[model samples]
Target: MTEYKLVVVGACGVGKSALTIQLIQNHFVDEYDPTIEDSYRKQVVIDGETSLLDILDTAGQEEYSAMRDQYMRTGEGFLLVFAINNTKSFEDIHHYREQIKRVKDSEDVPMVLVGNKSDLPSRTVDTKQAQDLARSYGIPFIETSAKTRQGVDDAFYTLVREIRKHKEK
Candidate 1:
């Protein structure tokens, strides 16, 4: 079994903890603000291989900018998340990407653009714009709903797959 170090990053109130908790615990958590940082682990089969994921659920607040670089330095892959209903959250994705690029010093790091909170009724960021953004980054983009368990696994699974591909490079 291989250990995959993954990071889940995004703006505050974008459901970062909810997404991680849902994936690890198999249940959704009601809007709890994680001020510090949290790490979660889960063992699962991705493409028939048992892999352990070390997921760092980061604080979305700005005070953690120093700590953000700390994790970015260690994570092998990352999930750049944003809330589908919040346009500002979507814009924050670029800052996260830029910080990561500076820390990792890789233009093609294994990263996935995730638009979460898909279960919400209203949407501020559409699919094409997100898809186009991911396309521009040359990475994959997925919409997820922590409350509905939609694309929860794919977000992590795809990151592992991307990490695998990064290994071959």
Candidate 2:
């Protein structure tokens, strides 16, 4: 089976842990428990191929900021996440993108720009703005709600597909 290491990253409270946990465990967590660093491994079939997906759910806190480069260096693909209701989180994505590129030493890394917390009310970041940013980076953009499980599968599968495509090249 093919093995892929993916990293989920963004500002704190952007639902990075929530999305990763929901996708791997098939459950939603209601509380906000800060993550320092966590890893989950799962076997999944994508496009008729069985693969081992090892996800590193990195901490969103600035105190853990120093570890991001190490995580980024090991990641094969990335899910650059942001909370749709938080404009500051949305704006921080650029820093994450640049960091990943620097760590990987490649601008053509596989990644998906995720606008999370779609189920929340009072969204400040417009979908078009996220889409436009993804377009500028030439990456896929998706909106997901960990609570509703909306677009969560698509976001992960899309990143895996992109990773496979990048590997082929």
Candidate 3:
């Protein structure tokens, strides 16, 4: 069995927790307070292989930015989630990338830029922008909807696949 460490990150209200819950539990959670403030670490078997996913759900609280940076330090794979309908969240990708590189000491770390909230038709962030940003950062990008359970699995499994490839080397 192999083990992998993964983290989900984004500003608050970008649906980071929603994606996590849907992926880990396969259900939608409404009325979920964005300010709950909790980071969950779990060991689960994916495709019969043992792995550890250390997910940090930052409170989008500006004060927690430092702690989020520290969490990024320990993460091997990053799932950068942003609201598809919020261009600002998408714009923050660069900042997050810089922060991750500063702490992790590598811009080459495996990452997946997730454009969340696909279920919402009024998307402010288009796929091209997300794709371009991911390409600029040399990372994978995918759109996901935690509400509709769309791409949630791909967003997760794709990251694990990348991690596995790195582990194989």
Candidate 4:
């Protein structure tokens, strides 16, 4: 079976792990245990497809930086997640991009910038900013809600589509 790996990254509590749970397990857990300092993995099979998706949910807090680095080094694509209700998490996308570039050194690696927590009403990050940033980086972006499962499949499918396209070349 062919397995594809993608890294999910963002600042702590920005919903990276929550989003992963929603996508892979089709469920969300608010009190998800903090990912181990350098160890966590999850996989799901795309229906009727040869691809099995392996996701690396990285700890966003500073201490996990090295582990995040190692994951990025081997990642085929990136799912850059942020809470739509938190501007700082959204703003950190650029820094995350830079850090990933420092290791992967290629913008060609497919990436999807996700604005999570879309179920919330008082979102601090504006849609325009997310769209603008994705455009600036030449990557796709979308809003998701692990709580409501909104955009969950779209986010994962879009990134997978991009990665498959990249592999064709």
Task: Order the numbered candidates by lDDT, best leading.
Answer: 1, 2, 4, 3
Cα lDDT tens digits, model 2, 9-89, are 898889888899899999998874684578899999998999899998888446535575675688999999999999999
**Least accurate 10 contiguous residues by lDDT in model 2:** 60-69
Q: What is the lDDT of residue 127 in candidate 1?
A: 95
lDDT tens string, model 3, 2-45? 55677777877889888888877788988578777566666777
Which candidate gets the maximum lDDT versus the true structure?
1
Weakest 10 consecutive residues of candidate 3 by summed lDDT: 55-64
lDDT of 3: 0.80
TM-score of each: 0.94, 0.93, 0.87, 0.88
lDDT preference between candidates 3 and 4, better one? 4
Q: Which structure is stronger by lDDT: 1 or 2? A: 1
Model 2 stretches with alpha carbons more than 4 Å out? 60-70
| Each candidate: RMSD | 1.6, 1.8, 2.3, 2.5
lDDT (CA) per prediction: 0.91, 0.90, 0.80, 0.81
Candidate 4 C-alpha lDDT tens digits along 31-125? 77675424244444555566777788877346546775676699888899999888888878888888888888777888999999999999888
